[PDB]
Amino acid sequence: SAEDKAAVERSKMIDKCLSREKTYVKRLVKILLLGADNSGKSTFLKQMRIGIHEYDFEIKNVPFKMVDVGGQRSERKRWFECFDSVTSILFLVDSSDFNRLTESLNDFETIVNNRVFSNVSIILFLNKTDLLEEKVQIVSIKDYFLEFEGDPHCLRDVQKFLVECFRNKRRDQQQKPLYHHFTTAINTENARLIFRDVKDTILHDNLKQLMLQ
């Protein structure tokens, strides 16, 4: 009856737009991005481009959505369940700054041990690796971490200790692995690293689905 037909046509147009974006939705990969002000998060995001902010980009024709939580923590079930569909958590840390390493470890422990983030993988980026070579051979990480074992002036020992410190803050039932990369925020290989880690995580899920028992 004149207006009814127009209303149905408008509904059909809206449905067509929704169907057009549905294929993108079913094929999108979401990653949490967590980092402090010293972690080089802004430089990392700017290099890949070249409140909570959403970054949309594509790697090898796969749509990605990095969710940048700008230091907002809520420790509530609703806030964590808002991110129950992410495939991975990306964590940037300033590996050089030993005085703020404990704060980063505590934040990591608070986030990755939530029941919502069970069955999501962790990609851990240790930025400022070039600055570690300067800071190593000048200061000793034993001055900040008395549990350190090895040569504090060796880069491999310090890097292994940092990755072990972050791995030990993950409680039991680690269904998904922890991926660590020693990179810089201006590195051009970071997108490929994230792509490979996410692909491995999704392969883990797919093979677990193939598991009969």
């Binding site: 209303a7 549905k22 939705v25 909570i52 907002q72 809520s74 806030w79 808002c82």
Partner: protein, 338 residues
């Protein structure tokens, strides 16, 4: 200095508890023992609203009891015509983590918000039918959890600041700030006369506020977990509250205490949404067990079950005329029940 005031607070709390005990002479169940039960209540899905691509977190009815606004994780609002299952609008949002949505009583504006810390106002009726952001309300330091229009110009929002705010949309300013909660405020409910409103926070407490004076008239306790939903009784002299302890409670404003508890042993999951029927006899509650339970509000009896959804029933809604019930869920579907 500190010890004296700490003891004074305890004495005042004991005095309030004693007054509440003195006003409690006969329980609601005892008085309503002689009222006949409402019997089995069967509601059937009349409409299924499909089109959302992700979990539906919020939903609000219109004053005309025909139009419907819904919010989903995919990052947009849809205005539905429930009589004909027609999409009137599809409004993309700047932030995809929307947690609440409001529909103005006039029908000219809708509101939404979430993790973006902003209450965004959209004008539905502009020139040549273009829906644009009329106003963005900033000032909340936490995620915005609920919003309800008082009129086209003022709106009350609750956030993770443990505070509520009354806004002026024309100026975009917080006219009045409501402080006093210790946990994150998760729910709101405007009184039918629009003069009072109750808020439920993550401190197992509900507070009654005066919009004009900006003060907490009463504080209600009794729950054991985070209050997720709250709703006034139709007459405005009482309200209901659902929390994560698998329990609904009915609180009286004038008696200033809990009247009766809605719970069952078989229910252990949290309650996401509560609503009343037009007469107040039915208390509809949505649960994490994929179901919506209908309660006899005067006898604390399960009148019926709404069991059409496949995921968490995240929102409920009853029309002003009381004809239909809209249930939103995490399966990206809205269902209309009679």
């Amino acid at each position: 200095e500190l010890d004296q005031l700490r003891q004074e607070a305890e004495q005042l709390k004991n005095q309030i508890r004693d007054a509440r005990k003195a006003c409690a002479d006969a329980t609601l169940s005892q008085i309503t023992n002689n009222i006949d039960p409402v019997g089995r209540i069967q509601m059937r899905t009349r409409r299924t609203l499909r089109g959302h691509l992700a979990k539906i977190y919020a939903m609000h009815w219109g004053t005309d009891s025909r139009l419907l606004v819904s919010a989903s994780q995919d990052g947009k609002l849809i205005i539905w015509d429930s009589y004909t299952t027609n999409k009137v609008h599809a409004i993309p949002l700047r932030s995809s983590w929307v947690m609440t949505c409001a529909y103005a009583p006039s029908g000219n504006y809708v509101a939404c918000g979430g993790l973006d810390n902003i209450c965004s106002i959209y004008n539905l009726k502009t020139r040549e039918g273009n829906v644009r952001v009329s106003r963005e309300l900033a000032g909340h330091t936490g995620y915005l959890s609920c919003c309800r229009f008082l009129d086209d110009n003022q709106i009350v929002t609750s956030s993770g600041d443990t505070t509520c705010a009354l806004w002026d949309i024309e100026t975009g300013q917080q006219t009045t700030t409501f402080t006093g909660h210790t946990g994150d405020v998760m729910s709101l409910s405007l009184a039918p006369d629009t003069r009072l409103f109750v808020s439920g926070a993550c401190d197992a407490s509900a507070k009654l506020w005066d919009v004009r004076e900006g003060m907490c008239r009463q504080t209600f306790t009794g729950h054991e977990s985070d209050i997720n939903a709250i709703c006034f009784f139709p007459n405005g002299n009482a309200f209901a509250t659902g929390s994560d302890d698998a329990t609904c409670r009915l609180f009286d404003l004038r008696a200033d205490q809990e009247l009766m508890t809605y719970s069952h042993d078989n229910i252990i999951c949290g309650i996401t949404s509560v609503s009343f029927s037009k007469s107040g006899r039915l208390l509809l509650a949505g649960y994490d067990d994929f179901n919506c339970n209908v309660w006899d509000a005067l006898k604390a009896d399960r009148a019926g079950v709404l069991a059409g959804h496949d995921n968490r029933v995240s929102c409920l809604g009853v029309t002003d005329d009381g004809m239909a019930v809209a249930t939103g869920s995490w399966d990206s579907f809205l269902k209309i029940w009679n």
